Structure formats: structure tokens, C-alpha cells
Amino acid sequence: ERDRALLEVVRGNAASVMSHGATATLEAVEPTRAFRDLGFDSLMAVELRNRIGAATGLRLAPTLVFDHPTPEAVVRHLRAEL
Amino acid sequence: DDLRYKVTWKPTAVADGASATGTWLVVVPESLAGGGWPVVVARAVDQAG
Amino acid sequence: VTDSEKVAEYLRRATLDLRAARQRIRELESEPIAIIGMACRLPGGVDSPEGLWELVDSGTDAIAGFPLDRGWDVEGMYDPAPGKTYVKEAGFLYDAGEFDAGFFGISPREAVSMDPQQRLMLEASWEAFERAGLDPARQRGTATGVFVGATATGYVSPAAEVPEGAEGFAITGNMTAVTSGRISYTLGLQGPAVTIDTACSSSLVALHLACQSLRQGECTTALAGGVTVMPTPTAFTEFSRQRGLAPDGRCKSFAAAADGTNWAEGVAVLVVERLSDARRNGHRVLAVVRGTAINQDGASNGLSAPNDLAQERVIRSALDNAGLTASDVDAVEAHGTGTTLGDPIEAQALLAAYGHERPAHRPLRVGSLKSNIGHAGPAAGVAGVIKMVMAMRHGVLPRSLHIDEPTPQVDWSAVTLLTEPVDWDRPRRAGVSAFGISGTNAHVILEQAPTQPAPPVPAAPWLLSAKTPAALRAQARRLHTHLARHPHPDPTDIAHALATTRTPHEHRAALVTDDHGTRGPALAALAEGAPDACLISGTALSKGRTVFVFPGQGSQWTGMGRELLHTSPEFAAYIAECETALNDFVDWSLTDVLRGTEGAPGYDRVDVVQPALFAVMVSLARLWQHHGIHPDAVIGHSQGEIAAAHIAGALSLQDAARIVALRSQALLPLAGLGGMTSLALPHDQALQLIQPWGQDLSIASVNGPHSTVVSGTTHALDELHTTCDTQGVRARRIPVDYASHSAQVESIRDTVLQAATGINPQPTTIPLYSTVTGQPIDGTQLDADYWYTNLRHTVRFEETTRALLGSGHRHFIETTAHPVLALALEETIEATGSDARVTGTLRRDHGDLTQLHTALATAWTHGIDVDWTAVLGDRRTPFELPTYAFQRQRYWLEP
Numbered sequence A: 001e002r003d004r005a006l007l008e009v010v011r012g013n014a015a016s017v018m019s020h021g022a023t024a025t026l027e028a029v030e031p032t033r034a035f036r037d038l039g040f041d042s043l044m045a046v047e048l049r050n051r052i053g054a055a056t057g058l059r060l061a062p063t064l065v066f067d068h069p070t071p072e073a074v075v076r077h078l079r080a081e082l
Numbered sequence B: 001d002d003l004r005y006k007v008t009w010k011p012t013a014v015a016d017g018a019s020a021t022g023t024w025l026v027v028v029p030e031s032l033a034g035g036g037w038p039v040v041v042a043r044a045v046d047q048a049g
Numbered sequence C: 001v002t003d004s005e006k007v008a009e010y011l012r013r014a015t016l017d018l019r020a021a022r023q024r025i026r027e028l029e030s031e032p033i034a035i036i037g038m039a040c041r042l043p044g045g046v047d048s049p050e051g052l053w054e055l056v057d058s059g060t061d062a063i064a065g066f067p068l069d070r071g072w073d074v075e076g077m078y079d080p081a082p083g084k085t086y087v088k089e090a091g092f093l094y095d096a097g098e099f100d101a102g103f104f105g106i107s108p109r110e111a112v113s114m115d116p117q118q119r120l121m122l123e124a125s126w127e128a129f130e131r132a133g134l135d136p137a138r139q140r141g142t143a144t145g146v147f148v149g150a151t152a153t154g155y156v157s158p159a160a161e162v163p164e165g166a167e168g169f170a171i172t173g174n175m176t177a178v179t180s181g182r183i184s185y186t187l188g189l190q191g192p193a194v195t196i197d198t199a200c201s202s203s204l205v206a207l208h209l210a211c212q213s214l215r216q217g218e219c220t221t222a223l224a225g226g227v228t229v230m231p232t233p234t235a236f237t238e239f240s241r242q243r244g245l246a247p248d249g250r251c252k253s254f255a256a257a258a259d260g261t262n263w264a265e266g267v268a269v270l271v272v273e274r275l276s277d278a279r280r281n282g283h284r285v286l287a288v289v290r291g292t293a294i295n296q297d298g299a300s301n302g303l304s305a306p307n308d309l310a311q312e313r314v315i316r317s318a319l320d321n322a323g324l325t326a327s328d329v330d331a332v333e334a335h336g337t338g339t340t341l342g343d344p345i346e347a348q349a350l351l352a353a354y355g356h357e358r359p360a361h362r363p364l365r366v367g368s369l370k371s372n373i374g375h376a377g378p379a380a381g382v383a384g385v386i387k388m389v390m391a392m393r394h395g396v397l398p399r400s401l402h403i404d405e406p407t408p409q410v411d412w413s414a415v416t417l418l419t420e421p422v423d424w425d426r427p428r429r430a431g432v433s434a435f436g437i438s439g440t441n442a443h444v445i446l447e448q449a450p451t452q453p454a455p456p457v458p459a460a461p462w463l464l465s466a467k468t469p470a471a472l473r474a475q476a477r478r479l480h481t482h483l484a485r486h487p488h489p490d491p492t493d494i495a496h497a498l499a500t501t502r503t504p505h506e507h508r509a510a511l512v513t514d515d516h517g518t519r520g521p522a523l524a525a526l527a528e529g530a531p532d533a534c535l536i537s538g539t540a541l542s543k544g545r546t547v548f549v550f551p552g553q554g555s556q557w558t559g560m561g562r563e564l565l566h567t568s569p570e571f572a573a574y575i576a577e578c579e580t581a582l583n584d585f586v587d588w589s590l591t592d593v594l595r596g597t598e599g600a601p602g603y604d605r606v607d608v609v610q611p612a613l614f615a616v617m618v619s620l621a622r623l624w625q626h627h628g629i630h631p632d633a634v635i636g637h638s639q640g641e642i643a644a645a646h647i648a649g650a651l652s653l654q655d656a657a658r659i660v661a662l663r664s665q666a667l668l669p670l671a672g673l674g675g676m677t678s679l680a681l682p683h684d685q686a687l688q689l690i691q692p693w694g695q696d697l698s699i700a701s702v703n704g705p706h707s708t709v710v711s712g713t714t715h716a717l718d719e720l721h722t723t724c725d726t727q728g729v730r731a732r733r734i735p736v737d738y739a740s741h742s743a744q745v746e747s748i749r750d751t752v753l754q755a756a757t758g759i760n761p762q763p764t765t766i767p768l769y770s771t772v773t774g775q776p777i778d779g780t781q782l783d784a785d786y787w788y789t790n791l792r793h794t795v796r797f798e799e800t801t802r803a804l805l806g807s808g809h810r811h812f813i814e815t816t817a818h819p820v821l822a823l824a825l826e827e828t829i830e831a832t833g834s835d836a837r838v839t840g841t842l843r844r845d846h847g848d849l850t851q852l853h854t855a856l857a858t859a860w861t862h863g864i865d866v867d868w869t870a871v872l873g874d875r876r877t878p879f880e881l882p883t884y885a886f887q888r889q890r891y892w893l894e895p
């Protein structure tokens, strides 16, 4: 159950960062699509880093969006050191 | 002025549209007979599928 | 040899090299460039170049009121003085805020922060590539240039403390250089990405630079384009202080009623390359840019003023660059701004340059696209060239609007305006001018493209794909509408164009039928999403290794491979090779058995069916490989493993034929002693169910988690069948008179060892998975004892399939004449919760090319790469398919 919750948190944070404001793009973050294929840059990469670290209370590297390009890879990485 | 309104006509882009499906029932006044709009729109739905 | 004949050969070599070098010079300076594609979005509902042509030919005036969704205070900013404007209508792209962010990978955050110039330009470039017969996804890594004529119209307003929403992206999203850079970044192009700032001349200058870059070999292809959008109405307010805009907003080009110039938006792009490269690559040439020229005026009466001398000089330079006399061209797409100051100067320049020695019955026909859509701005010249291109294609010059009378400021008494449309010995040529306000005059000359079969493959699949299902439905509807307006297109050409010249996206669908009466309804049912018989749909997998599966018996039916023998020559050749291999170890020919020749044995006999199954399976697998589906693994089932052992390369054709033939011949005496029965239960349940019968019965094969075949003596088999009927278990007796994978085979054990004698096993080229051991097996280990164990020990198909799925394999292609193990494979796949997709090659009473192409299309829809060149052809006639159906969303910045 932990993996599903972590994937949900990552999807929510990625959708919030990906949107300028305010559902269509929430489902656009599937576990297989690479973050770079979603058009993520250094700025949104560090924003996801800060958001995920605040959610999990864990200091992550500043490139945790292309070292693990899929959201599922990010979930695996989070579950590793947690 | 917090309760003032009016109606306007916003221009919009010509939509791509779609194809006419099945049968469409066109009803016309007989006074017009075969003049302008009826024949032309009948043809338009004809080539629209 | 004499001295004369000796020096003659040296002279011949020297003059041949001289001709080669001179031709090199000619193609290195005066090379004709080919317009292989184009794409424009201009005001008036125009979305394609055909939209532009039907707009301009019909004489439609595409000027309407100001947009209301852009936040402008349109009711307040109109005043027919201090900071207002006296025009309430111009050419606008009301869908300029519409952009498919997801398709290009762009985020909504970046998209709204990004300039609509870039947003329009990306889609225009993608459509321009698609309309050229090129797959943009295949352009990645090529030395393709990008030359965009754009300008910083101002969408984020860097001088005004850029908004909080577009924070961080107001450099990347708004630098004019990034307008050209983003095309190459998204498409992966390698040629230079240069944006040009030249006001009302940037796009034609970009075309010039692209031509020079291609002539020097710096690029293979190039994108020459321009874009203009109006985030704010300042362009109307600043130009309203001076009476430069027309009072009503109509650009009365070269007319006596010329009183101003209304601005307009629009994007317009061309995909171009060298004419020789286009001919070599077999791209369709729309037109030929022969020459180009650019210069300045400098000594103009004011900075923002024209100069007839400079315009004449650039026109003459462009003519000389193309090596064409002035009388060669019979049309000009003049700038035609509509200004009182600009029009007489431009008309005088055109009259002095072009019309001075023309015949007395072929005046130069001058027109302007600005009369229809207004002044496009940066994208003016690259839209005018599109207009002239379609004028040459359709052989008719469209009329230029709002010319009540030719303007009296110039002495026309050589050159005439296009008041009404005019129709058209020598190739058609036409000039285009993009004179700018910064003094940078530009001019290009275009020429009509020079004048440029195979048998139709039956049941050619029609392939469609899109990023999302809604986009796929839109693609289907667009294709249906396009095909409706076409007089009897060739279906194989459409199949080739769809398969090769369009990207394979995620959500895919296919139409496989051999009659031109069902494709239309199938396209419709795809459009509204209803199902159809000849329609296939699926979601392609991003990654996954391919498997070939070779079941044992059961996948037989009379006439299998008969149609393929005539229709498919590759299958015929493979069957012939199998027959030649089999002839020495059997007393009949494979072709007679398959074709049902008189006197040949039927499939009832065990010794003839198994070699026939082996040959058919091997030929089908080799046909799959010939079509480009190279397996990453192979798995078998009893005798099928022998066929797998051939495809893996461990066993030669002769050795596999020997093994299968002698094994079946040694299995002949077992006929009538026992048989098999397939019951749907777990392995443990079947095992404990066979306990009372003991050694009489045994687990023949564990096909799946709820499908097991038990073999044994006929009496015990009937007893177990009665017991299952009492217990209500769906037990089915297979049509076989021989109890393989049972103790009875021990009676023939030594003979089996004779069957495999003399073979020469080799290591596997493709990883082969043994169903006996349950994991990969070395190729050299396939010895006689292994084959005896295969005939004797229980098949463990379920375990090896689970292991193979554990190894990342995701596609299971059954190379049978009819699927027999697809049920068990799908049962295992859903049991283990994997996303693997199973497919088969042929089906019962279905073995023609239509079923083969159906299987291939199903495999492609599941995501397996297929070499459609082999299936369809190397090169068919080009076909103009509709571009991608983008699913756009509004993206605009609010204050």
C-alpha cells in the first residue's frame, strides 16, 4: 500500500508543479511516462525536489527528475532510502 | 455599476467541424420553394455525408 | 602507343574533371532549392495551405472584429487620439492561445509562460514536416536547419516586472532566438537554429539564409518560416498616431482608394531542401526557389521610408542569381502594404524592374495576399510564397481584393493588377517581395516543380496512431473526410503513406480488409469509437522483448498454407526448403500434403501431421522474421521445440527434419494404445486426481494455471473422463490416438535414441527456453537424451512462460496455423498480473494474405516494430494525408 500512496503523492506534486494554476493533467502523469517527456527543466526539477523532500522530510539530490525519469522510478528511489 | 450588463457577439475561430451522419430532416416553407438557402443547405448536408 | 593517342586520354581526363568542377561551382552558387512541404495558419479560419488557397481563390475577406478573450478593453480603446486607435477590425488568429502542450511535451506552465509565437511555430513546423512526406520523429539527429523570421512583439512584457505566473520561463519562453531553438530542441534537429529580426521582411530573409546554408552543405533540409502574434493592441495604437492604418482596416493594395495598412497575425513555414537531394530521396517537389537577393536602401527619405532604387536593385539581383530574364516570370506577389506612401514606390519599382521589354500580350500580373488577410508582418513573405506556390499548382492567379481602380500615382501605361482571377509553353515562374520597414528589401523567385508503378498488395493495412484516444478519433475522422473528397484513391498507396510517412504514436489502430466497401464504415466506427469486424485497436507498449511460441499438436486444419503457397513467395520458398530437407527422411512430399494432392496422406496419421506442422511453423516464423519481427526468445511445446530449435540456430534444417520425422515414425506403434485429455484445473488438483490410476495416467503438459493435459491408456482415460463428468470438470479429449509424454514411450525408447543420432547441435543464436528444464538451455546440450526426455517427461509450459515473463519478455507471437496456446498464455499473463499481449499468425479456415496482414497489424498495434517496407513496398506514389489532429487547449496570460 505504501508504494501506491507514494506514487499518488509524486503524481500530485508533479501535476501541481506542471500546472500554472488550479485535473486533465493530473491523469497525464502516468507511471511510465518520463518526466523529461513531460517537459521538465532544472527549475521544475528543483521544485519537485523541494516538494518531495518537504512531504517525506528527506534531503534529496537536486536532479531527482532525470536520474529517475519515470515517476515509478522516483517511487522506487524514495522507498529505497525510507 | 456593480449590476450593469449587456450582450455582445464574441468572434471565434471557424471550427474544424465533423461529418454529417445518417439522415437529417430539413423542413422548409413552401413559399420559398427552390430559391436560395433551402437548396444550398440541402446540398451542403448532401456533401457532408 | 603513339604520343597523340597517349595525350588524348590525358586531355579527356582533364576536360572531364573541368566539367565536373564547373558543375560543382554551378550547384554551389546557383542551386535550385525545392519546397518539399509547407504549413500555414493565417486569419480567416485558414489552418492548412489548402485552406489558404480556398480562402484566397474565393476572394474571401478575412478581417473581423478584435478578439474579446485577450483581455483588451476593446469597447474603451476605440476612438475615431491621445492613446487610442481608429480601427476596430483586423486579421486575427482567435485560436492563437490554443496549443497542444502535451503533444510536444511542453507543460501548461511553460506553455502559458511561453510566447504564442513559439506555440504556433512548433505546430506549424510539425505540420510542414508531415506535409512533406517526412516523419518528424525520424528527423531526429539529421543536419536540418531552422530559420525563423520572428520578433519580440511582447507577451510577457520584460519592461514591466514580468508576472508571477510566468516567472523563470520569461527568458526561455520569450527570447526570439528560442523561437527557432525550440523547434530543433523538440524535433532533435542538428542544423543551426537562427532567428532573424528584420520587422516586415524577416521570413523571406530567413528563406534566403536557409537557401545559402543548404547550398553550402551546412544543412540537408531546412525550415524557413515566420510568425506574428499580437498579445497587446499596441501595434494598432502606435501606428494610429500617424495616419498609417486604414480607417476601415482594409489593405487596398495598389488601389486608388489606398489609405492605410491594417496589421495581421499569422504563422507560415516551409520545409525545403536541395532539388537534387529531393530527386534522390523521392520527395514531392511543390515548387523550386531558383534565386534570392537581399539588400538595403540606406539613403531613404527617413528611416522608415521605402526606396524604388533599392527595390529595383534587389529584384534585379534575385533575377540574376536565378539566371532568369525579367520576362521569364509572369506573376509577382508584391508586398502591397496598402499605404499611400508605399504603394506607388513599390509599383514604380516593379514596373522599372520587371516590365520593360515584355511581350505586348503577357503583362506581369501583380497581386498581394495582404488584401485578403492584411499585413501579416514577419510572416508576410513566407505566406506570399505559399500563395504563389498554390497558384502555380492550381494554374490560376487569384484576384487581389478591394481594387476599385488602379492607383493614379503611377503610370501603368507592361504590368497589370489581379482585379479578377486569371488562368494560365515554358515553366510557370513567379516572384515574391517582402520589403521591410527597416530598409531590408528581400525578393525570391519561384518556379513550377519539374514533372516527375508496382502491383497493389492485397489487404494492405491502413494504420492510424495518436498520443491520446481522442486524438486518434480525430485522426480517423480527418482521414475519412479527406478520403471522401478524392476520386478513387489507391488503397495500397494510402497504406504505404500511413505506415511510413507518419509517426507511430502510443494509441494505435489498424484497418485490414481486402475489399473497398468496408474501409469507410470502419473509419467511421473508429471516429465515434464503435467496434468493427475489420478494425483493430490497442495501446502499444513502450518496451518489451519479443517471443516466438511453437505449440505442439492441435494447430492443424486441412488447406492450411494452401493460399499462402500461391500468394506469398517467401512462404513458398521456405516450404520448398523444408520439403527438400524432409525428402530424404520420408516417402512423400510436403507440398502434396499441404495442397491436398490426390493420394497424399491426410493429417490423421501421426507420422505425417507432425512434420507438416514443423514445416508450416518454421516457414511462418521465417516469414515473420522476413517481415522484420526478429524474436528475442523462442519457446516450444513437445515436437514444437524441434521447430524452435531450428529457429534458435541450434539445429540445422536437415537435423531438425531428421529428428521430427524419425521421432514421429518411432511414435507410430504407439497409435491406439492411449491418448490425451485436456482438463481445466490446477496442476496439484490434476496430480491428486490421477492418484487412484497410478502409473496408468500422467500429467502430459501443464499449459497454464487452470489448463492441464493428462496422457495415458484409453481405458484409464475414459475412466477419468467419466470421473470428471461426475465431478463436473470440463475435460476435453484431444483428437490423438497416441499417448505422448507418458510411460508408454519407454517401450520405444531405444528407437527414439536412433531418431536423434548423427545430429550436430550448436549454441543458440537466439535464447531458447526449454519447456523440460524450465529455463534457458545451452544449444549444444540438445542431444538424443534431451529429445527422449522431451517426448517422455511432462511439459512445464506454465513454469517456463512465467520465467520468460520474469525476464522482461512482453510479446508472444504464435507462429501456428491456428492459435492453440493463446488461451493458456493469456491465463498465465493475467495470473501473474503482467501487460503482455498474445497474438497468432493464422486461424482455422483463414490462411490467406488477409489473415497474415491482420496478424501483422495486430502485432504492430501491440507495439511490435514491423518493417512495413517489405509488407507494402520500397516506394509507392506519394499521397497527401491529413496532418496530425492536435487536441489544443487555451493558454494565455492574465493580468
Ligand SMILES: *P(=O)(O)OCC(C)(C)[C@@H](O)C(=O)NCCC(=O)NCCS
Pocket: A041, A042, A043
Ligand atoms: P538545468 O540544467 O536545465 O538549468 C540549470 C542552468 C540554468 C545552470 C542551465 O540551464 C545552464 O545554464 N546550462 C549551461 C548553459 C551554458 O553554459 N551556456 C548558454 C549561454 S549562458
